[model samples]
Target: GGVVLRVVTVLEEPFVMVSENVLGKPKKYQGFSIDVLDALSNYLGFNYEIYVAPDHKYGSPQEDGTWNGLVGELVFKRADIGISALTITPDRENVVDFTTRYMDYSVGVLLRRGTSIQSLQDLSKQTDIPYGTVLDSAVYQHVRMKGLNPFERDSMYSQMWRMINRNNVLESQAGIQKVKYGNYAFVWDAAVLEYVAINDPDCSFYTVGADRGYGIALQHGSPYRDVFSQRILELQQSGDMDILKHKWWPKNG
Candidate 1:
């Protein structure tokens, strides 16, 4: 009998995309992560089928007393494994085990074109320059953690709230729409920003700070964890991961 694997995912680009015109048809999820998963299945001598969880929130982390989204599917056993770009964090590790990092990248700022704001310093110096980020995301946490320097003051949690309340767009969605229409400044993962920029050259942006990495998440103690980890290491050692990265990222700037 052929092997079958039910995977859940979201519409985050360069990682996952939902087919726009297909109704009830199996949604097509593609990217470096999916490629790794496919390779792993091949190495393990198994065939698998991908499945979409009914809940769009499947595999997301909870915040502010609400149920964490995506992981909910895994916790409830709705799916066998989560193969998306979920980050490896200690809190999450309590609930699941992560495979060795398949991709190394980081979160950074994205600004609109022709803006004099070249660095984080310019962002802090100018009171008129507003920003935004994903609500309750690592970027938001980074903002809070940065604290009250000139730069930190503008990015502080309270400042972010005040800006939002005043209808000023200082957040992640602003960054996303900035890329979508080539306007506004925002923060996001470097890998994701690179992916979008590669596809759309008109979207003016750059990354700040050091890069980071993300890994695949699975149920704690899952036997397949080692299998997935080893395969990722093998791929990296063989330079396959680099090939995918080059395919998605721009050669310069």
Candidate 2:
């Protein structure tokens, strides 16, 4: 049989947003990452199908030692390629291979519009600026590492010890929604902060310095990894990636 590559993705706005028409057929996802996947598939000369992971809110690995979201799709061999806005973390790299870094990203502090908190330094000093984050997420880990002080006591992570004692953290479900409602002083993400700053008139945030980039994740020793990495480099060298960046995130806007 010919190769029938399966790609997995989730619906995360500005990265992968799914929408439905009036008739409500299968919703389609569109974003920069999806475009990149299309280009790579065409380049590789394969017949492929896109699969939407059930956990659509955020693409994070589940607790049962089985993959839950997009990562789960690859973990179970439900798909051959996992090309979502998957962050390239060392922990994940242990289980799978990642292509070359395609885009740089970093965690940032998001403050409600007109709030006193503007930078990391401001957030660090504010004793009453309640902050919220997902139960177990990279941002939560980041806060624990930074000793942000959470208001509640939870066995989320031993790293969260300092926050539990400090009584300043507010646990939440969705990181983006936490920032959206101004329920917390800050949530974290480089791209998300930028998105809010430009789009949300009532909110403003910034990163401490620069953010890091993430790459596409693949199964360990997968042959397609090298091909995808090379194509990414080609796009970068030819300025094609830059064009897409401008298209998605305009300079003047």
Candidate 3:
């Protein structure tokens, strides 16, 4: 039987974005995620309908003991697959199965270039410049870790949580501007930060920190998981992933 899947994603720059829209016509979705999706479909022989999550979030556990956003879509069967720049985290993994990561990313700190805050630990040790991440993001969730891990007693990640300016939490665009013109630092996904720093007009910011990666997600025990994972690995090995990454996020070098 021909397979068609409901693919839910979020609007994340360089990952998934609304490339074009005309009145009375469906909006055009394009970016790294769409390219990855197209590659997988062509190779695996499946059709998909892509739509943004209603809340446009990557998914996080709520206080009410339910999930929201992409993970929620899978958990509730509203979507057959979830993509975008969705990070692979333990919390989300418990409820969903993830494909082999197509992109390896990690936490990154974006701040003015001249400061003494040259590394992740440097920011954690200072108190003069307030720092924060995009509100409710996977990076934010990981940094704002509520419970301390056995090795987190004095870890830099925990230090960041304590010093993070709750008032400063904003979306990536806003946060980038904050760092561009203000005295704040923005901690975010490394790939996005690299894109921002490269594209910024002033060239006044730098980044640092580093774990984890982004993956395609499926409902737990979905039969399609293995096929997708194997194909993703093939794409990575064939250099298709690098080509896509460069298309969307070209490096200065």
Candidate 4:
């Protein structure tokens, strides 16, 4: 019952809050995901070590057929579990195993306060201020699928494509900071932008809309998949999941 699983996660608000620990290292991680893992582990009598993904990506397949972000960690056995706010997509599902759905979410856009960009199209059609995103975001493919041809693949932006695509190695957590200080926009899951905009007095950000739920990810063949999956159900049944949710995102109403 003392088994220690290596849990990997990204710094996503209301899910994982990664901050500095005593040594000024990114070791202190807290949030609903941490709470979920803690509750689950305590219930199952196991232990876990929380680790932040080096590149802070959620997960995305590369051209080489490999994965990155927390997904790569699980696929490569770098971590036994991934507890970030992972979206369950067929493309991702084919490569990894996910537990029962946890929360509903969606992809969205982030921009500087009072910016004129109305939608994703505005970034592609009008501005050259250079937008940013994580390399592992689904928006990358969505942008490509639009059949956008670049003007010339030489500048800060790739050439003559009717679209724009550039990624910061840092995920939205860091990329949003870039927008807080620079002339850039970011696209990712929606909540964090809203959270930061409301919380960070110095930075004013805005977001559009998005939809989907969150899940825990395990390696494709990990024996503990069902173990964790079943526990998720138990937690929900006991109202434990909602308890944790309210802790992270309290409801005023």
User: Model 4, which residues run further than 4 Å from truth?
Assistant: 23-27, 118-125, 145-162, 166-169, 237-239, 251-253
Which residue runs does candidate 2 get wrong by more than 4 Å? 24-26, 57-67, 142-161, 164-173, 201-211
The worst-scoring run of ten residues by lDDT in candidate 4 lies at 154-163
For each candidate, how many residue pairs have backbone atoms clashing (under 3 Å)? 15, 10, 0, 16
Tens-digit lDDT track of model 2 for 95-122: 7788988887676666656566655555
Off by over 4 Å in 3: 1-4, 165-170
Q: What is the C-alpha RMSD of each candidate to the true structure, in Å?
A: 4.4, 5.4, 2.5, 5.1
Ranking of all predicted structures according to TM-score, beginning with the best and ending with the worst: 3, 4, 2, 1
TM-score of candidate 1 on Cα atoms, chains taken together = 0.76
TM for every model, in the order presented, reads 0.76, 0.77, 0.88, 0.80
- Per residue, candidate 3 scores C-alpha lDDT tens digits across 225-246 of 8998898888899998889988
Error of 3 at 70 (Å): 1.8
Candidate 1 residues 107-157, lDDT tens each?
Answer: 656665566776654554555756655553445444444543455444544
